Design a protein around this ligand. Structure first.
Ligand SMILES: CSCC[C@H](NC=O)C(=O)N[C@@H](C)C(=O)O
Ligand SMILES: CSCC[C@H](NC=O)C(=O)N[C@@H](C)C(=O)O
Ligand code: NA
Ligand code: NA
Ligand code: NA
Ligand code: NA
Lengths: 168, 168
């Protein structure tokens, strides 16, 4: 079932989401199914549960290939609960992001180039991976959603903030 | 003639505009006529020349009444060239702004509560006024456009940044 994506301005995107506690459940599998479906219909590369007004530490992401980010390597399709994230150096990297809760826009956002993330797959198997570049960025971006944070609060150069069809 | 309003992302909104040097001219009157017309069609309370891709220190503003800002007192309809602005105290005030170059959005922006602004009417008569509250805010907002600045770079609380129909 495709869910409605709530847009910036909605208080529900500003919450700190509680943990998932129903790993391996039919309810959770259904929710993640919906998230993948919803992410697909909106052409996202990630999607965070709060974006569909469900207050939980849960995200999905990945693609074989992206139209939006053609140079991006494949990122494994992943559903991740109770994510925690750790930078593996201080090195930052700028890159383009946009948000489905902020349709039509993008900006350049600095993110850690290298991270580790940990959590659980929906069946309850533990996940821990090191990630870099775009893979890392995506997970940081989704992580932010889980703590009530959106990319505009991280823009440093506002000359890069603009509409997709316009930006130059 | 209604002009196209360029949207955030366009480099032309990021320029520092040169002075108007054709006060009292038919060309300038025509340009301001267009600006008032354009501002009217888009339901603005101000509009800055760079928003219609004309690189000049020129702005129009004012209304008898605003649907968008019903509590706002009338601000005199004004066309102002070569504006300069001076705060009259350090007191700041938060209020809602939106931008026609950023359709659909608004945020809370701190502005000087009290200013003086100076410049010329299109016929070349000098204008100097003291202004407060909403009158002041509008002129600051348009002034920003003339130096390559947009309101997102002044947002301090990003919880207030959001879509019009959503914000709560
Ligand atoms: C590259 S980081 C952006 C990840 C998000 N998911 C957000 O919750 C997107 O898929 N964004 C799309 C819309 C994009 O960047 O164009
Ligand atoms: C109240 S300050 C906003 C002034 C601008 N003019 C900008 O160049 C507007 O008229 N904004 C409208 C769209 C609004 O605030 O809703
Ligand atoms: Na928040
Ligand atoms: Na975008
Ligand atoms: Na600028
Ligand atoms: Na608005």
């Amino acid at each position: 079932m495709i869910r409605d994506i709530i847009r910036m301005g909605d208080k529900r995107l500003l919450r700190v989401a509680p943990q998932v506690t129903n790993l391996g459940s039919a309810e959770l599998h259904a929710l993640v199914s919906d998230m993948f479906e919803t992410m697909g219909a909106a052409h996202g590369v990630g999607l965070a549960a709060p974006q569909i007004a469900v207050d939980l530490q849960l995200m999905v992401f990945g693609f074989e290939a992206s139209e939006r980010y053609p140079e991006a390597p494949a990122v494994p399709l992943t559903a991740l609960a109770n994510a925690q994230i750790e930078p593996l150096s201080d090195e930052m990297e700028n890159g383009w992001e946009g948000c489905l809760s902020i349709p039509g826009l993008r900006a350049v956002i600095p993110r850690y180039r290298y991270i580790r993330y940990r959590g659980f797959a929906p069946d309850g198997s533990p996940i821990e991976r090191e990630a870099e570049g775009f893979h890392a960025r995506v997970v940081q971006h989704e992580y932010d959603h889980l703590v009530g944070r959106l990319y505009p609060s991280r823009i440093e150069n506002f000359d890069t903030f603009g509409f997709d069809d316009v930006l130059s």
